[PDB]
């Protein structure tokens, strides 16, 4: 499983003609680059601790593409405002998700190109990389404009070429800092409640990445399962509670790094 | 290696 994504954000400012553009890149759900407009000296800055293997030619060339993208979203924000005939006062947000995932062996499996205006979906490139999917009447205007020009061929060449080729460079430069997994530590805390019942809580502290599954298997198969939250230092944490009256039960933990499921009471 | 868009919205 190896992936690469480019999450672009464009939030306009009330009254100001220049909005704020944010381009953040990810390699296997891990951020390595970040660009901002409100920062003093807007340039691409290395976020990953292994991004020192790039010369000044890479940081200047990427800065050029970020400055160009900044102008593209600036115009597209005004073009979209007129489509819905929105009031020229408030601030609006335009987002884009462009990239591709390969899998175990390094080969293209699925390309991705999506656009979303104000959280809601707007236009997306299909799996065939030739036709587009629109959300409403205003999105159909963008579709005919991009089909008349033939923009589908331009985006197909990036996802097949430039994105795959540059992902191989990152995968080889930082293979030791990417393939690093940790076993999750478990502990169950006891808590009494009304009517003589006991609430059990299966904790999991210290795992990377957050792709984990905690299920309550009672004698070989109502439950309160919360979303995974990060610790902050570079690891993830998750817990699951069950309301059962009063007797020891087990909770199966499924992790990709662990060959056998780790489960232990108390 | 970020992508570059051609035709505006």
């Amino acid at each position: 499983p190896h992936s690469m994504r480019y999450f672009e954000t464009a939030v306009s400012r009330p009254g100001l003609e220049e909005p704020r553009y944010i381009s953040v890149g990810y390699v296997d759900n891990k951020e390595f680059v970040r660009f901002d407009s409100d920062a003093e000296n807007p340039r691409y800055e290395p976020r990953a601790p292994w991004m020192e293997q790039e010369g000044p030619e890479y940081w200047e060339r990427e800065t050029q593409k970020a400055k160009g993208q900044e102008q593209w979203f600036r115009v597209s924000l005004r073009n979209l405002l007129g489509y819905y005939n929105q009031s020229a006062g408030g601030s609006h947000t335009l987002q884009q998700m462009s990239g591709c995932d390969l899998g175990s062996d390094w080969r293209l499996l699925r390309g991705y190109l999506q656009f979303a205006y104000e959280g809601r979906d707007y236009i997306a490139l299909n799996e065939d990389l030739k036709t587009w999917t629109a959300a409403d009447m205003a999105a159909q205007i963008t579709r005919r404009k991009w089909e008349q020009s033939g923009a589908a061929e331009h985006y197909k060449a990036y996802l097949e070429g430039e994105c795959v080729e540059w992902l191989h460079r990152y995968l080889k430069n930082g293979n030791a800092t990417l393939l690093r997994t940790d076993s999750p530590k478990a502990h169950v805390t006891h808590h009494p409640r009304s009517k003589g019942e006991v609430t059990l809580r299966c904790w999991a502290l210290g795992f990377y990445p957050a792709d984990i599954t905690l299920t309550w298997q009672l004698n070989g198969e109502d439950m309160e399962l919360v979303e995974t939250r990060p610790a902050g230092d570079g690891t993830f944490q998750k817990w699951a509670s069950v309301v059962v009256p009063l007797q020891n039960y087990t909770c199966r933990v499924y992790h990709e790094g662990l060959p056998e499921p780790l489960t232990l009471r108390w | 290696a970020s992508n570059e868009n051609m035709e505006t919205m």
Partner: T-cell receptor
Amino acid sequence: QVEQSPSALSLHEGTDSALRCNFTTTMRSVQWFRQNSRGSLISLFYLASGTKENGRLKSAFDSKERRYSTLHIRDAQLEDSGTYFCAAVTGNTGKLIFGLGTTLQVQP
Amino acid sequence: TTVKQNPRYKLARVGKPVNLICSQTMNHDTMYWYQKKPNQAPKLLLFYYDKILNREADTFEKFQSSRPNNSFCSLYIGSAGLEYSAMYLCASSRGTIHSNTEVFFGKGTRLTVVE
């Protein structure tokens, strides 16, 4: 900046000579033009990276560092006499930066 | 397909104003206006990125410009002078200024200002 070489060139019929465009900084792409009898510019080649050939002419931008581009002319003919210009796309505000020009003259 | 540019030639007296039109069938977002004098390289005067005038070039405010729609763009001279006699060129590219797209040039318009 873009430095064009040579300033002027004189060839006999059938002579094979080449023009060179040298860039101080790295460029995203390059374009070669020939100036019209009326004074305007007609585009000859557009190169992203590689080598393009269209008859007697052949331009290249095969540099890994992207700091130079050449324009080869094979078998010079009197119908090729004129001023040639090279312009690279900077990748910044004011997209094209033009060279000073080369005045080619082919004697029959 | 190509950059249309009319008229072929323009004759105007010193003081009198001059209008210069330009048009393109393609949906090019960036348009340019160059000035090419005899024995000289074309000098950028201004560029437009979809109704956005970037007059960074031309540090003396010697030119005016108007781009009503994506297809049409104009170059205007308020008061003509002998300094303005040159071949005016119009150009267009697919992406933005920072893109590496081919810049297509028009056939030009030779202007000569007379006393």
